[PDB]
Amino acid sequence: MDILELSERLDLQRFHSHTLRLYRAVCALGNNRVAHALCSHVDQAQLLHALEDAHLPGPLRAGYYDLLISIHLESACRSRRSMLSEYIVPLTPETRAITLFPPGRKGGNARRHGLPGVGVTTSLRPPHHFSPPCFVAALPAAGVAEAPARLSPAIPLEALRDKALRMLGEAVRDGGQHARDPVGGSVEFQFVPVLKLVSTLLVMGIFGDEDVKQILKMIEPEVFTEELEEGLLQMKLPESVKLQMCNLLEYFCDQELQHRVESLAAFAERYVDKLQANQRSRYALLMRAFTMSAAETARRTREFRSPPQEQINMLLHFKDEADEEDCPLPEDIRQDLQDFHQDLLAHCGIQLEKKPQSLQELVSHMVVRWAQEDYVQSPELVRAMFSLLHRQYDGLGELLRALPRAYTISPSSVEDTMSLLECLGQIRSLLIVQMGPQEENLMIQSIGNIMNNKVFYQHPNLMRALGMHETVMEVMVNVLGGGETKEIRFPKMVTSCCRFLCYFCRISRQNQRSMFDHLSYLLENSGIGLGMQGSTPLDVAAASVIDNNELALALQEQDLEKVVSYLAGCGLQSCPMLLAKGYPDIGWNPCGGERYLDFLRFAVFVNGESVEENANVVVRLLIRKPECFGPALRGEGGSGLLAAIEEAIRISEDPARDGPGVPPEENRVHLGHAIMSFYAALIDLLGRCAPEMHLIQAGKGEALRIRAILRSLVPLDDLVGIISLPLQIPTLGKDGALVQPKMSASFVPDHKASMVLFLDRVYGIENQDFLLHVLDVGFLPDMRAAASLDTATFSTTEMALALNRYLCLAVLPLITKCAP
Amino acid sequence: ACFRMTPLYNLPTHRACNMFLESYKAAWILTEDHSFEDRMIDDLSKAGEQEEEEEEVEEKKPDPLHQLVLHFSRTALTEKSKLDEDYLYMAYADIMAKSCHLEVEVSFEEKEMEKQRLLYQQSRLHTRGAAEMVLQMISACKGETGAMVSSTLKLGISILNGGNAEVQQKMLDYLKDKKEVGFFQSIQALMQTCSVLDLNAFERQNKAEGLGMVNEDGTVINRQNGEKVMADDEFTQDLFRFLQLLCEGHNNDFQNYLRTQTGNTTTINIIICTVDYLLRLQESISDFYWYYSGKDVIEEQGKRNFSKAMSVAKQVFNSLTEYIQGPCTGNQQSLAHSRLWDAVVGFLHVFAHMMMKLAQDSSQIELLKELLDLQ
Amino acid sequence: GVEIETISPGDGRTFPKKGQTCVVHYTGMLQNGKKFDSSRDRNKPFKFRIGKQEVIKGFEEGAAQMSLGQRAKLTCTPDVAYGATGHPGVIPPNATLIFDVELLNLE
Amino acid sequence: LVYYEGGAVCTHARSLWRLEPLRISWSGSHLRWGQPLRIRHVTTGRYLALTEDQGLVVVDACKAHTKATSFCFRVSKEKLPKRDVEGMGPPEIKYGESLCFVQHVASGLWLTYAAPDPKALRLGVLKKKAILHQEGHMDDALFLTRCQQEESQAARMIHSTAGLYNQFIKGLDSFSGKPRGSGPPAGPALPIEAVILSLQDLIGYFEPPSEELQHEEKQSKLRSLRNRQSLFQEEGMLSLVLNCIDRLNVYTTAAHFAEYAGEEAAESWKEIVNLLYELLASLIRGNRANCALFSTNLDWVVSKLDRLEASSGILEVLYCVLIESPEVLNIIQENHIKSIISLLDKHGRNHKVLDVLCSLCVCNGVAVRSNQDLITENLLPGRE
C-alpha cells in the first residue's frame, strides 16, 4: 500500500516511524558496516524520492531525512566537526594571499565585510572516506578485528546540494504564499528536516562559493547583497526551526573566526620575514659598530645573545607607545603592525541606521528581536541563541580562546600531518563506543602511525595543542573501569598505549610538565595497575616525574602515603593473579612491591643526586609502616636480611618452590629472584634516599639523624655477607656446553651494585683494615670471575657484561674515592 | 649556550611565526581593552515591540535579560550530582558582574549621583531575579572550589556593592521561605577548603628560583607560572567580602540568621566556623614569622606572601566587625564563647615582633604600613 | 552451481574475457521475491574487474557466460554464493540468489 | 544486634528510634531528664532490652516486660522517674544539643561501644557493636536528631506493609504443593482485598510527578520519589515483590491458580499480577542503583516474556531498566535478543518492542557495536 495512506492509517504511521527510529539507532555512532547493510533495505532511490515527496506525513518525512543523514553523513560529519576546532595553517602562497578584507576602497580603516563562508580556507581538513555500497562483492576471507573498518556509504552530494537549494527555495516562497497546507502538515515539519540537511552539508563543506551566496540570499537577501523575496528570518517560525536557524548561523560565525585566524597567519608570514631581514641588517651593521663604539654595546648585543622569545617580545614591545625607545624597529615597519591592529578590531566591530548591513550586528539584532518578541521555551534553544549572542559582541575573546589551538606548519609536512590527523580522528571516534576487539587493533596501528610520523617529534607544541595524551588517558580510564575489579579487559591496548604515554613524556619536558598534573589522577588508576605487565601507569608516572629537578619538588605529599599504603598491601597479602597460576603461597608480593620501590627511586633520585626534601618524607612515611620491608627487618619475628637472601637464592635454584611446577611464556614468575629483586630495590631506594655528604659535614640535625637511623636499620655485617655471596659462573664442559645462568632466575650483579651504592652513600669506608676486609671477601672473587670470563667464549655472555657494568658503576668509583 | 647559539634570522619560518603569534596575543590582544557590557545589558534589559501588541492580560513576559536569568535558574535548580562546567555561564556571569560597579575634592552634591547610578544598575538586575542566581548557584555548587563559585561570588559582590538593603531583604526572604541546609553546608565546606600558608611548599618554591629554569622555545626570565602558596587568596578574600556585604548596614536579623536558622532543621553556626578558619590562619602566619625571626632580612617573595596573607586577614577582621556591629548580642556571645582569644593572643604576639623587626631597615616600610593598618 | 536464462540476447560474439573489466546493470533479489540490490536505483553501472575474485563465484562465472549487450537471469546456489554465513544483515545464510543482469558494456 | 554504623545508613530508616513513655496520658509532653520510657524500632516492631542470653538486643514486641526495656536520660554519669506533668512539660532536652547519657532504669547499665575491633572492622567500614556497659566510657555521647514527617510515615510504611505480604507469601507456599482438587484450601483465607488496596495505595504513593508541574516542584518531587524508592529497596521491598511474582508465576492460568488456592482467589490472579508489575515499574523507574540491581537477574525477567497474563507491565519494567543502566546493557546475550524478536512475532506490531530495541542499541550516548551487530544479524536479512 502507498505510504500516503498512512496519513490516515495512524497506527501504521507510528509503528513505521518507530521503525525508522530503530534504523537510525542501529546505524548510529559510526557503525558504517550496519549503515552499508541498511543501504540494501532502504536504497538511494528510496531516500531521494522520500526527500522529494511533498505529500508524505510529518514524522515519517522527518524520520527519512534524519535517516539519510544517519546512513551517509554522521560518521564523516562528527569527525570533520571535531577537526573544525583546530586550525593548522600551512605556509602556502594562497595562505599568503589570504587578506582580512576583500579588495575594496569603501573605507580606509575597514572595507565592507566579506561574505562569510565564501573564499579560500587553507585549514588542514582531512578528506572523507566514502565507499560505494557494493553488495554483490565477495565476503572477505579475513577474520574479524583485522579487516579494515567500513567507510561511509557514498551518495552524490554535488546533486544533493542542488536538490537542497531547490527545496529550501520552494519552502521560502511557500512561506511567502502562507498556504494553509504546509508540506508535512506543519511549518516545523516543512522546515526542520531541510535545515538539518543543509546544516550537515554545510559542516561537510559541500557547497561552493555561489551555493553559499544563494544560501545567504534565502537567509536574508538585502543584507547579503554585494557590490516573496524576503528572507526566512521574518516568517515567525516555530522554536524548533529557530533552533536549526541558530545552527545555521553559528557555522558562519565559525567561518568568520577561521577567516580571521588565517588572516593573522598570513600577516605573521609577511611580518616575520620583514623582521628577519631587519634583524639581519642590524646584526650586520652591529658587526662594524666596535670601531666607533665601546663597552656600551652590551644591551645592543643582548638581543643576539638572547634566545628569540624575548627578542620578539622586546621588538613587539611598542604597543603602548611609552616604550618606543627600547624597540629598534623602523617606524614604517611598526606602522604595518599598528595598521593591521586597526583593521582587525574594525573587522571585529570594536571601533572605527535600521539596516544592519552585515552579519555581525544582523544576528545580534535578530536574537534580541526574537527574545523581546516572545517568551522562548526550549532550553537548548535558549542555550544556542545566547551562545551566539555572546559570540557577536565579543569579537576578540573567541579569538583568544582559539589561538592556543592554532598553529603553523611547513608546507613540506602537510602530508605527514594528514596521516596523524586521520589517526587522531579514529581515536577521537572511539571515545563514544564501548571498547572492542575490533577497535583495539585499529587504534594500536593508529598510535603506531603516530610513532612513525616525523612531525610527532618535530612539533611537540602541536602535539600538546591537539592533546591526544589526555584523550588516551580517558580511554584507559574507561577500559580499566570496564572490569575495574574483575579483570583488565583488552590488556594489550592498555600496555601498548601506556607505552605511548611513556614515549610522550620522553619527547619533551613541557609534555612531561603538562602530564605532571594528572599523576594523582593516574595514581588511583595505578592501584589496579599492578595486574598488568609491561608498560603500566606507574611507569607512566615515573616517566612523568624523572630527569627534572623542578618536578618531584612540587610533588604533593598526599601521593606518598597512598603509595606506601599500597606497599603495605603488597607486603601483607599474597599476590592474587601470581598465586592463581599454581605458585606456592608466600604472604607478600615482591613484584608489586618492587614496582613501587623503583617508582619511589625515580621519585626521589634525579640527575645523579638525591632530593633531601622528598628523601626525608619518604623515609619517614616508609619507616612509619615497617610491615612492607619484607620477611626480614621487621624486628620481632624478623630473621636476617642476608639469611632471607640465601632463602631466596636456594629456593630459586630448587624447583617446585620457585615456580608453579608445570622463560616458557617469557613472563614466568621466579619467586626467589623476585624476593631478592625486591630487597635490592629496597636498599637502592634507601641508598638514593641517603643524605648528602656536604650536609653531613655541615652538621645539620635531621641530615645526621636520618643516616644514623639507617645505620641502626641495616647492619653492615649482613651487607658484607651479601658482598661475599657467590655468583654462578658460566662453566665450560660437556662438549663445550656453556652452563649459562638466566637473569630471570639467577642473582644479578646489578642487585649487588644496589647494595654497594647503599653502603657507599650511607655507611661509607673510614679505615684501611675494614676497607681490605670488605674488598677481599666479596669483591675479589667477583672481579677474578670477570677477569676469567674476559675471554673469547665468555665475554659476550650477559653475566660477563652485567659484571662489567656492575664493576664500572659501583665498585671502581667506590675504591677510586677510597684510594688514599 | 647563549654565547654559542644562533640569532633569530636562521630560525625556521613556521617556528618563528608560531613564536610571533604566541608573543603577539599576550602583548597586544590580552592587553587590549574594550568595554561592551553596558550595551550588552542595556539591550538585554530593554524590551521592545510589546507596544504594538499592547497586551493587557498582565502575563508579564520576560525581557531578554530576564529569560537568561530564568534559564540559569532552571539549570541551577535542576538536580545533578556535579555542577557541570558552562563556559557561556563564565562569559555571561563575568559580563553580568563587572557591568555593575563601573568604577580631587569631590563634594557630597555630585558624590551621590554615582551612588544612585550604581543602585540603578543593581536595580536593573535584582528586580529581575538576578538576586536568586547567587543563592541557587552556591546551594548547587555542593562545596567544591571552582570557576563557578568564583564567578558567582564576584557577581554577588557586584550586585551587593554599597550594601543594597533591598537585595539583602530578598536574600533573607528566599532563605526563610525555602528552608534548605545545603547553602550553609556548601559555605562551611567551601571556607574549610580555603588554604593557609605552608612552610614546606614555600621552601620548595624557594628552591625553584635558585634554578631559574626557562623554556626551550626561546627564554622566559623567571616565569610567572601558578604560585602554590595562597593561590586562592582572591577567592577567600571575595568570600569574606561577600559575607561582609550581606551584613553591611547593621542588618541585625540577617546576622541572627547567620548565627542560627530556626526554619532550617540543621543549624550551622558559621560565625564559630569563621573563627575556626581565623584560628587556622593564625598558626600559618605565626609559623611564617617562626621561619623569618632568625633571618635578619626578609626576601621579596616572602614580602609578597605577607601582603597577600594580611589582605585576607584584613578582610576577615572587617567581616568579623560586621557580624557583631549593631550590636548583635547573640554574635557577641558566640565570639566570646569561641576560640577567638587564642587567635587574638597569637596575632598580638606576632605583631609584637613585626614592627620591631621591620623598623631596623627602610626596605620593609610598605609591609609595615599595611601591617599597621591590619592591627 | 550457476544457471543462465537469456532474457534479451545481445551480441553473442564478444564474450567477456580476461584482461578487460565488465560493466553491468545488475538487479539482485532474494528467492522469496524480495529485492535486495540493484544498480539502476543508484543510477550507476556497476563495473567489476573479472578474474580477480572481487565478487562471488556464481555472479563471476554467470557474468562470464553471456556476451555483450545480453540480459540474463542468473541463478546462484549458496555453494557459489555467500552460503553458510550469508551477507551479514542483508542476505540470510544458505539462501539461493537470483540476478537480472544486463551486461551493458565491456571496458 | 545494635551498632554504631555510619554512612547512608544514618540517612536510612533503620537509624530511627521512637520513644514511648510509660504514661498513658500526656505521653507527648516535653522530656524531663530521667523519666522512664521505652524505645521501639520503626520498621521491625522490636524493643531494645537487656535480654538474658545476649545482653543488649532488640527483643520482639510480644516479650517487652517493661523492666528490661525502659531507660532514662541524664546529663552526667553520676547516680541520679519524677511526678509526670499533665501538660506541655518542661522543655529541656534539645535536638542536636543538650547532650545526655542514657542508662537502663532497672539494670543501671550505660550503653557504650564494644571496645574490641575484629578483622571486619580492621580495614573495612566501621559498624561498632553497642554493649550496655556497667559504667561506660567518656566519648559515648549521643546527638539527638529530628526525623522529617515523610521519613516517619515511610518508616511506618515498611513495617505495616511488609508483614501483610509476608503473611501472603506464607499463605502462597502453604498451598504451593498439595493441590486443592475439589475440597477446601490449605489454610487461612488470604487477604485479597486488603492486599489489593495496599497495592493501589503504594502505586499512588509511588506515582511520578505530573508533567505540568513547574520545574522547581518537579525536581523536589523527583528527589522525594528517588528517596522513597531507595529507602524501600534498602528495606528489601524489591526482594519481597520479587518473591511475590515468582510465587505467583508457577501457575500458568487462573485455573492453575484455582487448583491450589481456590476459586475465590482465581479471578483476582490477573489483577494482582498486573498490579505487581505496575508497582515494580514505579519502584524502579529512574533509579540508578535499583535499575543496576537487575543486572544480576536479567534472564529472570526475560523468562516471563512468553506469558500472556501481563506483557505490558513486564515490558515497561524492562524499558525502565534499559533507559537507566548501561551496565545492564552489557549483560545482553544472543538468546535474549531473539526472545525480544519473538515478542514481535507473537504479539503483533507493537512499537514498544521497537522502543525496547532502540534502548538496546545505545545507552548514555555510548555505542554498543556487539548489540547493534546482533540486531542487524537476527532481524534485518529475513525481512519478515
Of D105, D106, D103, the C-alpha closest to D75 is D103
Q: Is residue D153 classed as helix, strand or coil in its secondary structure?
A: helix
Of B366, B189, B373, the C-alpha closest to B277 is B189
Nearest-Cα distance to chain C for A20, in Å, is 16
Of A262, A30, A250, the C-alpha closest to A125 is A262
Indicate if C99 belongs to the active site: yes
The DSSP element (H or E) to which A77 belongs, if any, is: helix A74-83
Neighbours of A510 (CB within 10 A): 15
Was B51 annotated as part of a binding site?
no
- State the method: cryo-EM
Of B101, B235, B261, B89, the C-alpha closest to B176 is B261
Of A714, A709, A681, A707, the C-alpha closest to A693 is A707
Supply φ then ψ for residue A149, to 5 degrees. Answer: -65, 145
Neighbours of C31 (CB within 10 A): 11
Nearest-Cα distance to chain D for C72, in Å, is 25
Q: Which are the contacts of A228, defined by CB distance < 8 A and separation ≥ 6? A: A172, A173, A175, A176, A177
Q: Is residue D20 classed as helix, strand or coil in its secondary structure?
A: strand
Distances C104 to A98, A134, C15, C25, C47 between C-alpha atoms, Å: 49, 18, 12, 7, 10
> Rounded to an integer, what distance in angstroms lies between the CA atom of residue A70 and that of residue A38?
11
- Gaps after residue numbers in chain A (C–N over 2.5 angstroms): 227, 352, 662
Indicate if C48 belongs to the active site: no
Contact yes or no for B78 and D96 at CB 8 A: no
CA A583, chain centre distance (Å): 39
Q: Write out the three cell numbers for A735.
A: 662438549
Task: Say yes or no: C30 contacts chain D, CB-CB below 8 A.
Answer: yes
The DSSP element (H or E) to which D208 belongs, if any, is: none
Of A544, A677, A692, A567, the C-alpha closest to A621 is A567
* CB contacts, 8 Å: D319 with chain A: none
Q: Residues of B33-64 as b/e, b for ≥16 C-beta within 10 angstroms?
A: eeeebeebbebbbebeeeeeeeeeeeeebbbb
Q: Write out the three cell numbers for A23.
A: 534504523
Of A36, A203, A234, the C-alpha closest to A135 is A36
| Annotated catalytic residue, options C15, C37, C48, C98 | C37
Contact yes or no for A19 and D354 at CB 8 A: yes
Torsion A53-A54-A55-A57 (CA) sign: positive
Q: Which are the contacts of D60, defined by CB distance < 8 A and separation ≥ 6? A: D45, D46, D47
* CB pairs < 8 Å spanning A and C: 53
> Rounded to an integer, what distance in angstroms lies between the CA atom of residue B156 and that of residue B321?
20
Could you tell me which chain A residue has the CA closest to the CA of C101? A136
> Rounded to an integer, what distance in angstroms lies between the CA atom of residue A665 and that of residue D257?
61
Q: Which residue in the block uniquely carries the three cell numbers 555510548?
A: D366
Crossing angle of helices A44-52 and A58-68, in 10° steps, is 140
Of A40, A108, A111, the C-alpha closest to A71 is A40
Task: Say yes or no: A14 contacts chain D, CB-CB below 8 A.
Answer: yes
DSSP calls for B258-305 = HH--SSSSS---HHHHHHHHHHHHHHHHHHHHHHHSSSSS--HHHHHH
Q: Is residue A139 classed as helix, strand or coil in its secondary structure?
A: coil
Contact yes or no for A135 and C90 at CB 8 A: yes
Q: Which residues pair with D3 in a beta bridge?
A: D129
Indicate if C59 belongs to the active site: no
Q: Is residue D110 classed as helix, strand or coil in its secondary structure?
A: strand
Q: Which are the contacts of D49, defined by CB distance < 8 A and separation ≥ 6? A: D56, D57, D58, D59, D64, D68, D69
Amino acid in the structure at residue D338: K
Task: Say yes or no: A40 contacts chain C, CB-CB below 8 A.
Answer: yes
Contact yes or no for A137 and C41 at CB 8 A: no
Q: Which residues pair with C76 in a beta bridge?
A: C2, C97
Q: Write out the three cell numbers for B332.
A: 557577641
Could you tell me which chain B residue has the CA closest to the CA of A338? B28
| Annotated catalytic residue, options C50, C59, C91, C99 | C99
Please report all neighbours of C, defined by 3+ CB atom pairs within 8 A: A, D
Task: Say yes or no: A438 contacts chain C, CB-CB below 8 A.
Answer: no
Distances C8 to A207, A716, C41, C74 between C-alpha atoms, Å: 43, 102, 21, 13
Was B132 annotated as part of a binding site?
no
Contact yes or no for D355 and A438 at CB 8 A: no
Question: Cβ(B141)–Cβ(B80) under 8 Å?
Answer: no
Which of B264, B265, B268, B269 should be substituted to probe chain D, the one whose Cβ sees the most D Cβ atoms within 10 Å? Answer: B265
Indicate if C98 belongs to the active site: no
Of D381, C49, C89, C35, the C-alpha closest to A150 is C89
Q: Residues of B268-300 as b/e, b for ≥16 C-beta within 10 angstroms?
A: bbbbebbbbbbeebbebbbebbeebeeeeebee
Distances A515 to A47, A522, B192 between C-alpha atoms, Å: 49, 10, 29
CA C63, chain centre distance (Å): 6
Question: Cβ(B338)–Cβ(B270) under 8 Å?
Answer: no
Q: Which residue in the block uniquely carries the three cell numbers 628552591?
A: B207
Could you tell me which chain D residue has the CA closest to the CA of A22? D358
Contact yes or no for A436 and D369 at CB 8 A: yes
Amino acid in the structure at residue A616: N
Of A59, A68, A58, A64, the C-alpha closest to A183 is A58
Of chain B residues 321-340, which have a CB less than 8 A from chain D? none
Cβ-nearest to B218 among A264, A308, A557: A308
Q: Which are the contacts of D328, defined by CB distance < 8 A and separation ≥ 6? A: D291, D292, D294, D295, D298, D321, D322
Q: Write out the three cell numbers for A47.
A: 531516500
Amino acid in the structure at residue B130: A
Verify cis geometry, omega within 30 degrees of 0, for the bond prior to A660: no
Contact yes or no for A44 and C54 at CB 8 A: no
Q: Which residue in the block uniquely carries the three cell numbers 540486531?
A: D375
Amino acid in the structure at residue C30: L
Q: Which residues pair with C4 in a beta bridge?
A: C74
Cβ-nearest to D367 among A11, A12, A28: A28
Contact yes or no for C91 and D381 at CB 8 A: yes
Of B277, B373, B256, the C-alpha closest to B324 is B256
Task: Say yes or no: B177 contacts chain D, CB-CB below 8 A.
Answer: no
Nearest-Cα distance to chain D for C54, in Å, is 22
> Rounded to an integer, what distance in angstroms lies between the CA atom of residue C63 and that of residue C65?
5
Q: Write out the three cell numbers for A543.
A: 616517566
For chain B, give the number of residues. Answer: 375
- Pairing between β-strand A87-90 and β-strand A406-409 as defined by DSSP bridges: parallel
Q: Which residues pair with D51 in a beta bridge?
A: D55
| Annotated catalytic residue, options C26, C50, C59, C91 | C26
Cβ-nearest to B77 among D96, D146, D216: D216
Task: Say yes or no: A272 contacts chain B, CB-CB below 8 A.
Answer: yes
Name the interface residues of D facing A (CB cutoff 8 Å).
Answer: 330, 349, 351, 354-355, 357-358, 361-362, 365-370, 372-373, 375-376, 380, 383
Q: Which are the contacts of D316, defined by CB distance < 8 A and separation ≥ 6? A: D277, D278, D281
Indicate if C79 belongs to the active site: no
Burial grade of B350 (CB within 10 A; 0-12, 13-18, 19 or more): middle
* CB contacts, 8 Å: A507 with chain B: none
Task: Say yes or no: C35 contacts chain D, CB-CB below 8 A.
Answer: no
Nearest-Cα distance to chain C for D378, in Å, is 8
Q: Write out the three cell numbers for C14.
A: 564478444
Q: Is residue D71 classed as helix, strand or coil in its secondary structure?
A: strand
Contact yes or no for A26 and D366 at CB 8 A: no
Q: Which residue in the block uniquely carries the three cell numbers 529557530?
A: A242
Q: What angle do CA D5, D6, D7 make, to 5 degrees?
A: 140
Burial grade of A108 (CB within 10 A; 0-12, 13-18, 19 or more): exposed
Q: Write out the three cell numbers for A743.
A: 637473569
> Rounded to an integer, what distance in angstroms lies between the CA atom of residue B218 and that of residue A311?
9
End-to-end CA separation in angstroms for chain B:
51
Q: Write out the three cell numbers for C88.
A: 551479514
Q: Write out the three cell numbers for D212.
A: 505540568
Please report all neighbours of B, defined by 3+ CB atom pairs within 8 A: A, D
Q: Which residue in the block uniquely carries the three cell numbers 595514581?
A: A523
> How does DSSP classify residue A433?
B
Question: Cβ(A577)–Cβ(B240) under 8 Å?
Answer: no
Could you tell me which chain A residue has the CA closest to the CA of C50? A137
Contact yes or no for C89 and D377 at CB 8 A: yes
Cβ-nearest to D146 among B74, B77, B265: B265
Contact yes or no for C90 and D380 at CB 8 A: yes
> Rounded to an integer, what distance in angstroms lies between the CA atom of residue B237 and that of residue A800?
66
Contact yes or no for C92 and D381 at CB 8 A: yes
- What is the 3-state secondary structure of chain C? CEEEEEEECCCCCCCCCCCCCEEEECCEEECCCCECCCCCCCCCCEEECCCCCCECHHHHHHHHHCCCCCEEEEEECCCCCCCCCCECCCECCCCCEEEEEEEEEEC
Could you tell me which chain A residue has the CA closest to the CA of C27? A136
Of A96, A114, A378, A61, the C-alpha closest to A246 is A378
Could you tell me which chain A residue has the CA closest to the CA of B60? A375
> Rounded to an integer, what distance in angstroms lies between the CA atom of residue D27 and that of residue B101?
60
The DSSP element (H or E) to which A85 belongs, if any, is: none
- Pairing between β-strand A130-131 and β-strand A152-153 as defined by DSSP bridges: parallel
Contact yes or no for A138 and C36 at CB 8 A: no
